[PDB]
């Protein structure tokens, strides 16, 4: 190679820089995969858990993180960087309500998160937070939205989302899935959010190995599903 | 200077000198008439003289593909710009960073 | 090697970063100024005159800085705009303090102390900019000065700096005038000098620039003269060239 | 060896302008012709 | 003003579509003081338009080449460069329509003494290309190869050869 | 050994890291700016990776004031920094002078911002060049900055991938004056010159400067121009 | 008051295509005069002046700070300054000393740099701008100047009758004031030229 040894955050003669694009493979040491789907008035997060020990608890494992009453998120990547990322998200959501007097849009929150990650690329002397964040929320006169924020400081909004280890396989499914014209009537959404992940990993859980966050324009509160109603939808797509 | 006593440079030639070398190599060539060799050497700001031959070969090469023996002043006007060749420095950002 | 910051000294012993900066001025444009009684002038070279540009400023090398001084520029554009914004702000600070214009030398020493100070404190890049000075005062009249990346300066009667500005000084000494220093004698000398440096034939008026500074009834006007009147100055030089070979 | 080259070259310059005695000018032209081939690199203006 | 101008162009479209030439040939003589009423550089296209509607009726060889030589003599008497070059390019195309032997080439010689000398570039690509037809029409194969290649190197510096590309192809 | 830092020179020439940052501009999306007789046309190239990405989320043509627009070619996340910088800096003129800032005046100041990240010694320069447009005092303006800090004024130019083809195109393709509409027809034709796929209303994104202010086009407006576009 | 420490009077008046401005000449401490040639009208470019009145410290101080900001403005831009732009510039300079304020009240008069359009405005001691169409006044003898200008002003006036109106306004109002006088200077400017006259006033 030309071989700058990429020790700090400077350029290469090819034109790119390697330390930030080493953080994209820093997500993959979580050993995890997450999916968000926006089809209609509802939006669904789905993510598996991995409990390796019986001494380890169950309630303190969940990656679903409630940011505000109407905005929830899911975190991938390594664990310790993910929770500190959430603390800035909870903090700056409350400064919006204080400064501006109304509830923050889900679109504006990813601009604030990505700009914090941008400074760590532009200015040196802080490790750039190897974790990824996926949001959901309801916006009036806009419907529901799904956003992803990258460690580079990139964000975009899009319908079907994969993160973790198996992006390219799961996104290959959803292109084949979301090319037709469906109406996604809240059990159409949850079923595909399972069955996009239910071509990929070849697992078979009894219904206690995932988490599902949901939001809906009938109750815009963020909502983590019950183990019983997870079992309901797991045999409702499923005859 | 105990060993080598004369150290002699060789600059690229002048317009009169580019005129003269052109006269040397076009001697055996077969010029038409009405042709100005002075303006041809005016078209070379900083030639070597090993490429004044290259003009004389390519002008004769243009007549060869026609199965012809003639020449024009315009044939040299094409051959000078053929021999002279630049980098054509792109994007102007390098060139104007550095004013 | 001794490739580090501006600190340190080499053994034997000199300063390589200053030498790399001062040598790199030879890759810049070309600027010069001449002797004159009752006036002073500057001349410069348009680089990169590709046809998809606008020239919305019509004044690029020249920066009228106070009211009766201007300057050329040569070097990195990034460092060039920093100094010109600084140097105009020096002169108004003096004028606020005394209500009298800055007398054309201690302006220069004020900048050269700033340009010096990045060579001693680390870790800063020295300014890779050299530039000239023209001006009039109460104490000496018309003047010329020569800035350096080191922070050194000097007062000249005719000088040049830039791309091929090592042989242009030889023509200045070959055509040195003294006593006779009129502007028309000085303008006619300037177009001949740029003809030697620039290898572009016939010397298009879109490739040069001429700015003058005269003294009229207590005003000290500054003229950046337009492309229409460069034409009578070029063809006059073209006329004098064809007439000069009639003796042969 | 620089001095001996100057002494030979100044003698050659007198033969060029057809002489035997050697003026001051032959030593001036010998000094310019012989010496300027190596002298490269000095910080003029930087010191004083 | 314009309602009298378009009424003549209303009659001018009638003389073209319905197929009559003697009253149309009078109209080509009628519009000659009418020319100096609009833009000078865009008056030539209106003359080009009325000439194309004049020629594309029928092979009536009694008046076509004669009225074209008349307007050239007006361009001798009025001296507009772009208008006379518009008339010369059509005339040498008309010379090729009957395959005139020398004067088609002699007209192409006398115009290209100036076209490579003047400032325009786009018209030169066509008249170099039209000579490559007539040197091939005289069955001079190496010269037509030579004139075509000189048209190739000229053709690479124009805003649009939008239809002239396929003509060259 | 000189290609790793910024505060020192090379023994012969210039700064290495600024030249490497300009290589990042060449690897960006293509973009075209054309200054017409009455307006300025900006145009860029917006292809998403998959079908999944929404096109109405992130924009390229971006207003700064009501008469000042701005595009780029480089890295998108660094673009959002100096946009928000140029917004807040445009208001500071207006709080002082009570007058909309002229387009020559921002580019004095925005380049001085991009200046400051080329200093010592633990920051990186930007990897974004810009194209700035505006119609101030009748005559329009079209400027271009760079990560070094220089700034210019083009009749027409292009940046991004395959720009040298677009330079040679627009070198053949410019005249002194066309209208604002014919500038749009020739700005889509040069974006089509280097493109891969069917150019639709969502693959491109176009904004213009009238003398009546800055506005970016809706997809319906951009469809109808691209419909019957030569 | 502090405004009544040195006195002063500045008047501007709008004409047809021209504009006039006038001031007194007396400098003095509270009751004792010192000199009769104190400048209170300062040129800010061509066809655009400014007048200052109030505490004579802040008269000379603000006129130097404003000249400091003007020359930096006219070098970053090749154009000259517009009259609205100067009014926004002065009101910024006064409001920065919001709680330590300069004791002066400026009056700006001038023409448009491109067209011929006249312009007059005046400001408070903290920077509230106020544009009018007939006249503005400032100084200690304000109420005397309102009584003259409300009666003598006409809408469309040549530079002859504009000169005679502002002369009769300034001579009669200042002679009723105690701490203002000792001569009156008048600038009348227009598109073609600038006329400066000094009037024959009571020196008592």
From Swiss-Prot, chain B:
Disulphide bridges in this chain? none
Output the superkingdom of the source species. Answer: Eukaryota
The record's subcellular locations are:
Cytoplasm; Nucleus
Q: How does it assemble?
A: Component of the 19S proteasome regulatory particle complex. The 26S proteasome consists of a 20S core particle (CP) and two 19S regulatory subunits (RP). The regulatory particle is made of a lid composed of 9 subunits, a base containing 6 ATPases including PSMC5 and few additional components. Component of a complex with USP49 and RUVBL1. Interacts with PRPF19. Interacts with TRIM5. Interacts with NDC80. Interacts with PAAF1. Interacts, in vitro, with the thyroid hormone receptor (in a thyroid hormone T3-dependent manner) and with retinoid X receptor (RXR). Interacts with ERCC6.
Family, as annotated: Belongs to the AAA ATPase family.
* Function description: Component of the 26S proteasome, a multiprotein complex involved in the ATP-dependent degradation of ubiquitinated proteins. This complex plays a key role in the maintenance of protein homeostasis by removing misfolded or damaged proteins, which could impair cellular functions, and by removing proteins whose functions are no longer required. Therefore, the proteasome participates in numerous cellular processes, including cell cycle progression, apoptosis, or DNA damage repair.
Q: What is this protein called?
A: 26S proteasome regulatory subunit 8
State the organism of origin.
Homo sapiens (Human)
Organism phylogeny = Eukaryota, Metazoa, Chordata, Craniata, Vertebrata
UniProtKB/Swiss-Prot annotation, chain D:
Subunit description: Component of the 19S proteasome regulatory particle complex. The 26S proteasome consists of a 20S core particle (CP) and two 19S regulatory subunits (RP). The regulatory particle is made of a lid composed of 9 subunits, a base containing 6 ATPases including PSMC1 and few additional components. Interacts with SCA7. Interacts with NGLY1. Interacts with PAAF1.
Name the linked condition: Birk-Aharoni syndrome: An autosomal recessive disorder characterized by failure to thrive, severe developmental delay, intellectual disability, spastic tetraplegia with central hypotonia, chorea, hearing loss, micropenis and undescended testes, as well as mild elevation of liver enzymes.
Role noted for this protein: Component of the 26S proteasome, a multiprotein complex involved in the ATP-dependent degradation of ubiquitinated proteins. This complex plays a key role in the maintenance of protein homeostasis by removing misfolded or damaged proteins, which could impair cellular functions, and by removing proteins whose functions are no longer required. Therefore, the proteasome participates in numerous cellular processes, including cell cycle progression, apoptosis, or DNA damage repair.
Phosphotyrosine modified-residue sites: 47
What is this protein's record name? Answer: 26S proteasome regulatory subunit 4
For the modification Phosphothreonine, which residues carry it? 42
Task: Give from-to of the shown chain within the full protein.
Answer: 393 to 440 of 440
Cellular compartments annotated: Cytoplasm; Nucleus; Membrane
Corresponding gene? PSMC1
**Which family is annotated?**
Belongs to the AAA ATPase family.
UniProtKB/Swiss-Prot annotation, chain F:
Entry's induction text: Down-regulated by antioxidants BO-653 and probucol. Down-regulated in response to enterovirus 71 (EV71) infection (at protein level).
Under PANTHER family, the record lists:
PROTEASOME SUBUNIT ALPHA/BETA (PTHR11599)
The annotated subunit structure for this chain is: The 26S proteasome consists of a 20S proteasome core and two 19S regulatory subunits. The 20S proteasome core is a barrel-shaped complex made of 28 subunits that are arranged in four stacked rings. The two outer rings are each formed by seven alpha subunits, and the two inner rings are formed by seven beta subunits. The proteolytic activity is exerted by three beta-subunits PSMB5, PSMB6 and PSMB7.
Protein name stated in the entry: Proteasome subunit alpha type-2
Q: Does the keyword Transmembrane helix apply?
A: no
Q: Where in the cell is it found?
A: Cytoplasm; Nucleus
- Record carries keyword Cell inner membrane: no
Alphabetical UniProt keywords: Acetylation, Cytoplasm, Nucleus, Phosphoprotein, Proteasome
Q: GO cellular component terms?
A: cytoplasm; cytosol; extracellular exosome; extracellular region; ficolin-1-rich granule lumen; nucleoplasm; nucleus; P-body
The record's function comment reads:
Component of the 20S core proteasome complex involved in the proteolytic degradation of most intracellular proteins. This complex plays numerous essential roles within the cell by associating with different regulatory particles. Associated with two 19S regulatory particles, forms the 26S proteasome and thus participates in the ATP-dependent degradation of ubiquitinated proteins.
According to its UniProt record, which protein family does this protein belong to? Answer: Belongs to the peptidase T1A family.
Q: Which residues cross the membrane?
A: none
Encoding gene, per UniProt annotation: PSMA2
From Swiss-Prot, chain G:
Q: What start-end ranges are recorded for coiled-coil regions in this protein?
A: none
Compartment(s) of residence: Cytoplasm; Nucleus
SUPFAM superfamilies hit by this protein = N-terminal nucleophile aminohydrolases (Ntn hydrolases) (SSF56235)
Induction (record text): Up-regulated in asthenozoospermic sperm.
PROSITE patterns per the UniProt record, alphabetical: PROTEASOME_BETA_1, PROTEASOME_BETA_2
Keyword terms, alphabetized = Acetylation, Cytoplasm, Host-virus interaction, Nucleus, Proteasome
Q: Keyword tRNA processing on this protein? A: no
The lineage's top-level taxon is: Eukaryota
Q: Which residues carry this modification: N-acetylserine?
A: 1
Per the record, residues carrying N6-acetyllysine are: 76
Cytoplasm as a keyword of this entry, yes or no, is: yes
Q: Which residues cross the membrane?
A: none
Please cite one Gene Ontology biological process associated with this protein: proteasome-mediated ubiquitin-dependent protein catabolic process
Please name the Pfam families in this protein's record: Proteasome (PF00227)
Any one cellular component term from GO for this entry? nucleoplasm
| Subunit structure as annotated in this protein's UniProt entry | The 26S proteasome consists of a 20S proteasome core and two 19S regulatory subunits. The 20S proteasome core is a barrel-shaped complex made of 28 subunits that are arranged in four stacked rings. The two outer rings are each formed by seven alpha subunits, and the two inner rings are formed by seven beta subunits. The proteolytic activity is exerted by three beta-subunits PSMB5, PSMB6 and PSMB7.
Briefly state the protein's biological role: Non-catalytic component of the 20S core proteasome complex involved in the proteolytic degradation of most intracellular proteins. This complex plays numerous essential roles within the cell by associating with different regulatory particles. Associated with two 19S regulatory particles, forms the 26S proteasome and thus participates in the ATP-dependent degradation of ubiquitinated proteins.
The protein's matches in PANTHER family, at most eight in alphabetical order, are given as: METALLOPROTEASE TLDD, PROTEASOME SUBUNIT BETA TYPE-3
The UniProt entry's sequence similarity note says: Belongs to the peptidase T1B family.
Q: Which organism is it from?
A: Homo sapiens
């Amino acid at each position: 190679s030309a071989g700058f040894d990429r020790h700090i955050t400077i350029f290469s003669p090819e034109g790119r820089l390697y330390q930030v694009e080493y953080a994209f493979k820093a997500i993959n040491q979580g050993g995890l995969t997450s999916v968000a789907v926006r089809g209609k008035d509802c939006a669904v997060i789905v993510t598996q858990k991995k409990v390796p020990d019986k001494l380890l608890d169950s309630s303190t494992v969940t990656h679903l993180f409630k940011i505000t009453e109407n905005i929830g998120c899911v975190m991938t990547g390594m664990t310790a960087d993910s929770r500190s990322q959430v603390q800035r998200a909870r903090y700056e959501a409350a400064n919006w309500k204080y400064k501006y007097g109304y509830e923050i849009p889900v679109d504006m929150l990813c601009k604030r998160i990505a700009d914090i990650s941008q400074v760590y690329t532009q200015n040196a002397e802080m490790r750039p937070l190897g974790c990824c964040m996926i949001l959901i929320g309801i916006d009036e006169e806009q419907g529901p939205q799904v956003y992803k924020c990258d460690p580079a400081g990139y964000y975009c909004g899009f319908k079907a989302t994969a993160a973790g280890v198996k992006q390219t396989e799961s996104t290959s499914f959803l292109e084949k899935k979301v090319k037709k014209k469906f109406d996604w009537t809240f059990e159409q959404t949850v079923e595909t959010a399972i069955t996009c992940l239910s071509t990929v990993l070849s697992i078979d859980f009894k219904p206690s190995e995932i988490e599902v966050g949901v939001v809906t324009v009938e109750n815009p509160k963020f909502r983590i599903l019950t183990e019983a109603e997870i079992d309901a939808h797991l045999v409702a797509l499923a005859e | 200077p105990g060993r080598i006593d004369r150290k002699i440079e060789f600059p690229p030639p002048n317009e009169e000198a580019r005129l003269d070398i052109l006269k040397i190599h076009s001697r055996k060539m077969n010029l038409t008439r009405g042709i100005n060799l002075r303006k041809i050497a005016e078209l070379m700001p900083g030639a070597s003289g090993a490429e004044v031959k290259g003009v004389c070969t390519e002008a004769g090469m243009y007549a060869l593909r026609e199965r012809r023996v003639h020449v024009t002043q315009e044939d040299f006007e094409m051959a000078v710009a053929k021999v002279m060749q630049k980098d054509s420095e792109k994007n102007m950002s390098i060139k104007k960073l550095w004013k | 090697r001794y490739d580090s910051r501006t600190t340190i000294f080499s053994p034997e012993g000199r300063l390589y970063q200053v030498e790399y900066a001062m040598e790199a001025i030879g890759h810049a444009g070309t600027c010069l100024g001449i002797l004159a009684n009752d006036g002073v002038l500057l001349a410069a070279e348009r680089r990169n005159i590709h046809k998809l540009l606008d020239e919305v400023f019509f004044s690029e090398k020249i920066y009228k800085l106070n009211e009766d001084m201007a300057c050329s520029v040569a070097g990195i554009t990034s460092d060039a705009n920093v100094l010109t914004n600084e140097l105009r702000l020096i002169a108004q600070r003096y004028l606020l303090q005394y209500q009298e214009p800055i007398p054309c030398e201690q302006l220069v020493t004020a900048l050269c102390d700033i340009k010096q100070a990045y060579t001693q404190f680390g870790g800063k890049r020295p300014f890779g900019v050299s530039l000239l000075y023209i001006g009039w005062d109460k104490h000496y009249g018309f003047q010329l000065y020569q800035s350096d990346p080191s922070g050194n300066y000097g007062g000249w009667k005719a000088t040049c700096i830039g791309n091929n500005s090592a042989a242009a000084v030889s023509m200045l000494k070959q055509d040195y005038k003294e006593g006779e220093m009129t502007l028309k004698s000085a303008l006619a000398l300037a177009i001949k000098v740029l003809n030697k440096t620039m290898d572009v034939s016939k010397l298009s008026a879109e490739k040069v620039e001429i700015a003058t500074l005269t003294r009229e009834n207590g005003k000290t006007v500054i003229r950046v003269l337009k492309q229409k009147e460069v034409e009578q100055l070029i063809k006059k030089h073209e006329e004098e060239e064809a007439k000069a070979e009639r003796e042969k | 060896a620089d001095i001996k080259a100057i002494c030979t070259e100044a003698g050659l310059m007198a033969l060029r302008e057809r002489r035997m005695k050697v003026t001051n000018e032959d030593f001036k032209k010998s000094k310019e012709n012989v010496l300027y081939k190596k002298q490269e690199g000095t910080p003029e203006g930087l010191y004083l | 003003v314009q309602v009298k101008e378009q009424s003549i162009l209303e009659l001018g479209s009638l003389l073209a579509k319905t197929g009559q030439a003697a009253e149309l040939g009078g109209l080509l003589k009628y519009v000659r003081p009418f020319l100096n009423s609009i833009s000078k550089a865009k008056a030539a296209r209106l003359v080009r338009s009325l000439l194309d509607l004049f020629l594309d009726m029928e092979a009536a060889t009694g008046q076509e080449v004669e009225l074209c030589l008349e307007c050239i003599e007006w361009a001798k008497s009025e001296k507009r460069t772009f208008l006379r070059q518009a008339l010369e390019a059509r005339l040498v195309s008309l010379y090729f329509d009957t395959k005139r032997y020398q004067e088609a080439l002699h007209l192409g010689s006398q115009l290209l003494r100036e076209l490579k000398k003047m400032d325009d570039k786009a018209l030169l690509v066509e008249v170099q290309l039209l000579e490559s037809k007539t040197y091939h029409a005289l069955s001079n194969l190496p010269k037509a190869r030579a004139a075509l290649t000189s048209a190739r190197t000229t053709a690479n510096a124009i805003y649009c050869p939008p239809k002239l590309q396929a003509t060259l192809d | 050994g000189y290609s790793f830092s910024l505060t020192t020179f090379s023994p012969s020439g210039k700064l290495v890291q600024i030249e490497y940052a300009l290589a990042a501009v060449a690897g960006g999306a293509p973009s075209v700016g054309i200054k017409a007789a009455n307006g300025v046309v900006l145009a860029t190239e917006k292809k998403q990776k998959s079908i999944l990405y929404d096109e109405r989320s992130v924009h390229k043509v971006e207003p700064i004031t009501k008469h000042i627009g701005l595009v780029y070619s480089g890295m998108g996340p660094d673009y959002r920094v100096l946009v928000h910088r140029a917004r807040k800096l445009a208001q500071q003129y207006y709080l002082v002078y009570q007058e909309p800032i002229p387009t020559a005046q921002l580019v004095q100041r925005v380049a001085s911002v991009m200046q400051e990240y080329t200093q010592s010694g633990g920051v990186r320069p930007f990897g974004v060049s810009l194209l700035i447009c505006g119609w101030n005092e009748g005559r329009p303006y079209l400027f271009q900055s760079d990560p070094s800090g220089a700034y210019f004024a083009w009749k027409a130019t292009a940046m991004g991938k395959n720009y040298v083809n677009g330079k040679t195109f627009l070198e053949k393709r410019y005249n002194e004056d066309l209208e604002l509409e014919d500038a749009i027809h020739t700005a889509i034709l040069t974006l089509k010159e280097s493109f891969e796929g069917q150019m639709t209303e969502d693959n491109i994104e176009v904004g213009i400067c009238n003398e009546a202010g800055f506005r970016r086009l809706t997809p319906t407006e951009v469809k109808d121009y691209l419909a019957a576009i030569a | 008051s502090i405004m009544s420490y040195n006195g002063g009077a500045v008047m501007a008046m709008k004409g047809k295509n021209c504009v006039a401005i006038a001031a007194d000449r007396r400098f003095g401490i509270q009751a004792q005069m010192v000199t009769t040639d104190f400048q209170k009208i300062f040129p800010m470019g061509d066809r655009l002046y400014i007048g200052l009145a109030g505490l004579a410290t802040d008269v000379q101080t603000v006129a130097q700070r404003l000249k400091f900001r003007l020359n930096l403005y006219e070098l970053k831009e090749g154009r000259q300054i517009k009259p609205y732009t100067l009014m926004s510039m002065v009101a910024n300079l006064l409001y920065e000393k919001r709680f330590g304020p300069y004791y002066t009240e400026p009056v700006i008069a001038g023409l448009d740099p491109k067209t011929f359009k006249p312009f007059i405005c005046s400001l408070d001691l903290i920077g509230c701008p106020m544009v009018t169409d007939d006249f503005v006044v400032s100084g200690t003898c304000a109420e005397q100047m309102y009584g003259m200008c409300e009666s003598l002003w006409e809408p469309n006036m040549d530079p002859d009758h504009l000169f005679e109106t502002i002369s009769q306004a300034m001579l009669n109002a200042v002679d009723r004031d105690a701490v203002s006088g000792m001569g009156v200077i008048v600038h009348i400017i227009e598109k073609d030229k600038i006329t400066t006259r000094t009037l024959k006033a009571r020196m008592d």
